[PDB]
């Protein structure tokens, strides 16, 4: 019967690892590097688009940075199509919470929900897992600014600074070196871009090969603003920090 052709996506190896999760992580390690840095007065999301073309329409393009709601955003590393399935589910979950409790969803609760969906694909159903790693940048009134990551295993962890995708080993060492707790957003912006500029497989880091975003309390009085950077704005910040 059909058993003959079943790859068995949800099984342990003899060493106690999940084959498909490990291979999904191998897939993600070839994806464009995404970096998240949390500061005292905001969060930075920086990500590298993969070998683009001159004929790609950049201003209308979105492959890395997505908006889940007004308070929470994500950086993607892996299969974009897989990520959009999960992103739309997360957007719905945030709205369900808002409808139920009349309050914006706490960042962790949203992260846990998505991570539980990923987990399910590793334990039951016989389907391949989502080849996606997220960096969640968000704010709520309980914990303030928060950075999380989730991977195909459905495991999630909190971070002060973190990278996913390609060259995370090198990127994490550079972040661990220059990061400090009293750091600010403008400094974090510079750190993120400098780290990408050194870890990138490309010859030089340019505006057309980047997506950039910040979550700031730099909004008029006690409230939070999401800023998805435009191509021209990424070009300006690259000049400001002294990379181009």
């Amino acid at each position: 019967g059909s058993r003959r052709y079943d790859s068995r996506t949800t099984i342990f190896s003899p060493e106690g690892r999940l084959y498909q999760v490990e291979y999904a992580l191998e897939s993600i390690s070839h994806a464009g590097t995404a970096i998240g840095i949390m500061a005292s007065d905001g969060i930075v999301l920086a990500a590298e688009r993969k070998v683009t073309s001159t004929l790609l329409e950049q201003d209308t393009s979105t492959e890395k940075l997505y908006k889940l709601n007004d308070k929470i955003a994500v950086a993607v590393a892996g299969l974009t199509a897989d990520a959009e399935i999960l992103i739309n589910t997360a957007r719905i979950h945030a709205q369900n919470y808002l409808k139920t409790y009349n309050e914006d969803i706490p960042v962790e609760i949203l992260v846990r929900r998505l991570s539980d969906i990923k987990q399910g694909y590793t334990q039951h159903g016989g389907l391949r897992p989502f080849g996606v790693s997220f960096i969640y940048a968000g704010y709520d009134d309980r914990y303030g600014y928060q950075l999380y990551t989730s991977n195909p295993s459905g495991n999630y962890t909190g971070w002060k600074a973190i990278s996913v995708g390609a060259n995370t080993s090198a990127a994490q060492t550079l972040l661990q070196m220059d990061y400090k707790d009293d750091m600010k957003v403008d400094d974090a912006i510079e750190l993120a871009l400098k780290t990408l500029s050194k870890t990138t497989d490309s010859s030089a880091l340019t505006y057309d090969r980047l997506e950039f975003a910040t979550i700031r309390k730099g909004a008029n009085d006690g409230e939070v603003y999401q800023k998805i950077f435009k191509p021209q704005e990424i070009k300006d910040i690259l000049v400001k920090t002294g990379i181009t």
Binding site: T100, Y101, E103, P106, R142
Partner: protein
């Protein structure tokens, strides 16, 4: 059941609920507590059809307690009231709706404010300085409209509440066997044992 009252003063919320339970022509109990603690700083009183009231209240209680354990965090009275409203609005179009009216008295520790929410069985939510369900408001709202201030103390709130109960005891044909009074403030929930 019958009478449930609520009043939000300066620094607390006071809920008064009748003690009577009647089956047929006989009063079975005169010490019934028509309330459930949803969280340390949130109390819900209830009144409606027999059986449905306690089942609904305990179901809500279980859900809020589950949330508290999961997040290690107390939901705001506003969030709890919205959750309760949705459950009732969901219920009214069910095969057999839960015929329950509730008052939710809570102290928001974040804003340092008492909050009183009135929700009927249809899922009609309103935030109020004082509220009631059924016929209770017909007798008591004129007194509350007259005497209520937002800067009242807990003691003044209790005195105004006594006046409301006295009016009910005079003009209602119904013997509701007095009320159990509970106070919700920053320190949590406590019962006034002499009223």
């Amino acid at each position: 059941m019958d009478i449930i009252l609520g009043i939000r003063v300066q620094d607390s919320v006071i809920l008064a609920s009748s003690k009577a339970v009647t089956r047929g022509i006989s009063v079975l109990k005169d010490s019934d507590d028509k309330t459930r603690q949803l969280s340390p700083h949130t109390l819900m009183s209830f009144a409606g059809e027999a059986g449905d009231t306690v089942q609904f209240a305990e179901y809500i209680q279980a859900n809020i307690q589950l949330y508290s354990i999961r997040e290690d965090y107390e939901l705001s009275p506003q969030a709890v009231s919205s959750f309760v409203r949705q459950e009732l609005a969901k219920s009214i179009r069910s095969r057999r709706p839960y015929q329950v009216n509730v008052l939710i008295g809570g102290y928001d520790k974040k804003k340092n404010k008492p909050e009183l929410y009135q929700i009927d069985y249809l899922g009609t939510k309103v935030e109020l300085p004082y509220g009631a369900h059924g016929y209770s408001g017909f007798y008591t709202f004129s007194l509350l409209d007259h005497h209520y201030r937002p800067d009242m103390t807990t003691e003044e709130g209790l005195d105004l509440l006594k006046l409301c109960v006295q009016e009910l005891e005079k003009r209602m044909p119904m013997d509701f066997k007095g009320v159990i009074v509970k106070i919700v403030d920053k320190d949590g929930i406590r019962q006034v044992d002499d009223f």
